[PDB]
Ligand binder design. Structure first.
Ligand SMILES: *C[C@@](*)(O)[C@H](CCCNC(N)=[NH2+])NC(=O)[C@H](Cc1ccccc1)NC(=O)[C@H](N)Cc1ccccc1
Ligand SMILES: OC[C@H]1O[C@H](O)[C@H](O)[C@@H](O)[C@@H]1O
Ligand SMILES: C[C@@H]1O[C@@H](O)[C@@H](O)[C@H](O)[C@@H]1O
Ligand SMILES: [Ca+2]
Lengths: 95, 254, 191
């Protein structure tokens, strides 16, 4: 038992090795010891803060998504949709 | 464009061919109805500024079909820090004498916001470079518009994998490499000015502009492109302010 | 500002941590991971750690080859430069989970007998590879690629989690088609 100290956090469980251990985390955590909350790093450098186009990091407050001219922000607050006819960067024959 | 394909008609809608006195000069990308981004180098040797045309909706140079629209180019603006016959600041903004009409076969490419360009789009792997320029280094220029997917490298890597040469210029911060070092696929001469376009979530955006290289698809070398995102704020100022009166304008940079 | 060096992969049973050096003096680190044709994906945002768990990224496809890189920032920039844009970084080796992941030390889970012929049954260990949120077994991931070596008091072999022998044991997870980390460590010994 390297696992004797239960070093696996946030509900994840330990499997011993020789001179080490391994944490199996539940879906929402990662890290060696399950220390990292997947749901906790919603910043723009991280996968465009989940924004379809533009992203803004706000200090102290949840990030916001925005869009290009000729697009407007949807209800989900992440997706944009063209508000024009020929919106930049989309291929009409392919739409 | 070395080792690419014909762009299926209408799927490269933001491609401009630029002609002068009738003949191929360069490519460009269309950023809205009167505004076309190119490379500044395309304009070093120009004589008849008058006959500088800009063709959109084109596809087969060899045959006139539907969809081509031509337009006199009223103004070429190049950054003030660009020095003729040097690689740095290879970008231009062209104002057409009249809007092109948006159609299925003429559609603009988004100029993204800088910190979207920088943090997001710069780490999408592949992006398309296109043109009607040479099909092999010293070979024939294309007739059906050529497209090519290439991968982007961070300058550190581009400097690690490149066979050195006594004066291949620096890759500056206004530049970036992409393509292949193995000799197979690259952009070539007369592709200059054309788009390097990056696909993200479902919209294309302009991340780079065809610029320079050591030959085309040279072994141990990558294509170099203007990092468009270092320029976004300057282009937009220029798109927002009052026409000034020249054909060639050397607008300030930064 | 100084760049990461000695970027190493510590991977056992598909639990995969990239470690590196140095411990940060007023800089932070972020890690990126791609496959060779994929986009880069950031992890461990502005950490002062010298590790990064990449399991959730690498187990999305064990057979792919992953590259990771580790950027270096003065505390409270990101940015840059320049020499030429771009934050300072350094690259890991390539890493192909399926081939290179250390096989965890097995645990013999059964030892019942049929007289003169003895049955030892190796436990079908779970790995970090999820599917519908729920972990896949060592035998699930490898299949007819993984075989076992047995010891006793001399040697014996099987594919499966089953031996039958002739009148104290260890086993060994073994994958012969492996260029590297071919044989696991010896299980704990049972009598
Ligand atoms: C304008 C363009 O059409 C063309 C694009 C070629 C891109 N090549 C690759 N491999 N992607 N570019 C040129 O013709 C440029 C023009 C130029 C720019 C600055 C200074 C001088 C000329 N020419 C080159 O790319 C030269 N190979 C530049 C060069 C490369 C290596 C050493 C010295 C000079
Ligand atoms: O491998 C030894 C480990 O055992 C357990 C401890 O909580 C952990 O902190 C330590 O590193
Ligand atoms: C992933 C872990 O595996 C099992 C349990 O011991 C824990 O509760 C956790 O679900
Ligand atoms: Ca035509």
């Amino acid at each position: 038992d390297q696992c004797a100290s239960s070093p696996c956090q946030n509900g994840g469980s330990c499997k011993d090795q020789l001179q080490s251990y391994i944490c199996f985390c539940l879906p929402a955590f990662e890290g060696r010891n399950c220390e990292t909350h997947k749901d906790d790093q919603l910043i723009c450098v991280n996968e465009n803060g989940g924004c379809e186009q533009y992203c803004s990091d706000h200090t102290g407050t949840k990030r916001s998504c925005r869009c290009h001219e000729g697009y407007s922000l949807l209800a989900d607050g992440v997706s944009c949709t063209p508000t024009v006819e020929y919106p930049c960067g989309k291929i009409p024959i392919l739409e | 464009i070395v080792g690419g394909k014909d762009c299926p008609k209408g799927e490269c809608p933001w491609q401009v061919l630029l002609l002068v006195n009738g003949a191929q000069l360069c490519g460009g990308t269309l950023i809205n109805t009167i505004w076309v981004v190119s490379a500044a180098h395309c304009f070093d040797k120009i004589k008849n500024w008058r006959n500088l045309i800009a063709v959109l909706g084109e596809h087969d140079l060899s045959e006139h079909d539907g969809d081509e629209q031509s337009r006199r180019v009223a103004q070429v603006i190049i950054p003030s820090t660009y020095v003729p016959g040097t690689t740095n600041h290879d970008i231009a903004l062209l104002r057409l004498h009249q809007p092109v009409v948006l159609t299925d076969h003429v559609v603009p490419l988004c100029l993204p916001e800088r910190t979207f360009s920088e943090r997001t789009l710069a780490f999408v792997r592949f992006s398309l470079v296109s043109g009607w320029g040479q099909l092999l280094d010293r070979g024939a220029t294309a007739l059906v518009l050529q497209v090519l997917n290439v991968p982007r490298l961070m300058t550190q890597d581009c400097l690690q994998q490149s066979r050195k040469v006594g004066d291949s210029p620096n890759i500056t911060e206004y530049m970036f490499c992409a393509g292949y070092s193995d000799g197979s696929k690259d952009s070539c001469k007369g592709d200059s000015g054309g788009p390097h376009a990056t696909h993200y979530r479902g919209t294309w955006y302009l991340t780079g502009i065809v610029s320079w290289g050591q030959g085309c698809a040279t072994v141990g070398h990558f294509g170099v492109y203007t990092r468009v995102s270092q320029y976004i704020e300057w282009l937009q100022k220029l798109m927002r302010s009052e026409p000034r009166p020249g054909v060639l304008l050397r607008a300030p940079f930064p | 500002t100084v760049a990461a060096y000695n970027l190493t992969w510590k991977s056992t049973n598909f639990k995969t941590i990239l470690e590196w050096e140095p411990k940060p003096v007023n800089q932070v680190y972020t890690v990126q991971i791609s496959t060779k044709s994929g986009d880069w994906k950031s992890k461990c945002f502005y950490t002062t750690d010298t590790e990064c768990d990449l399991t959730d990224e690498i187990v999305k496809d064990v057979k792919q080859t992953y590259l990771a890189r580790v950027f270096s920032y003065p505390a409270g920039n990101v940015e840059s430069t320049g020499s030429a844009g771009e934050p300072l970084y350094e690259n890991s080796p390539e890493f192909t989970p399926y081939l290179e992941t250390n096989l965890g030390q097995p645990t013999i889970q059964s030892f019942e007998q049929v007289g003169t012929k003895v049955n030892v049954t190796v436990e079908d260990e779970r790995t970090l590879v999820r599917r519908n949120n729920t972990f896949l077994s060592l035998r699930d991931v490898f299949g007819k690629d993984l075989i076992y070596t047995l010891y006793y008091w001399k040697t014996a072999k099987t594919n499966t989690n089953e031996f039958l022998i002739d009148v104290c044991f260890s086993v060994q997870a073994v994958i012969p088609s492996r260029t590297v980390n071919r044989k696991s460590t010896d299980s704990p010994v049972e009598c």
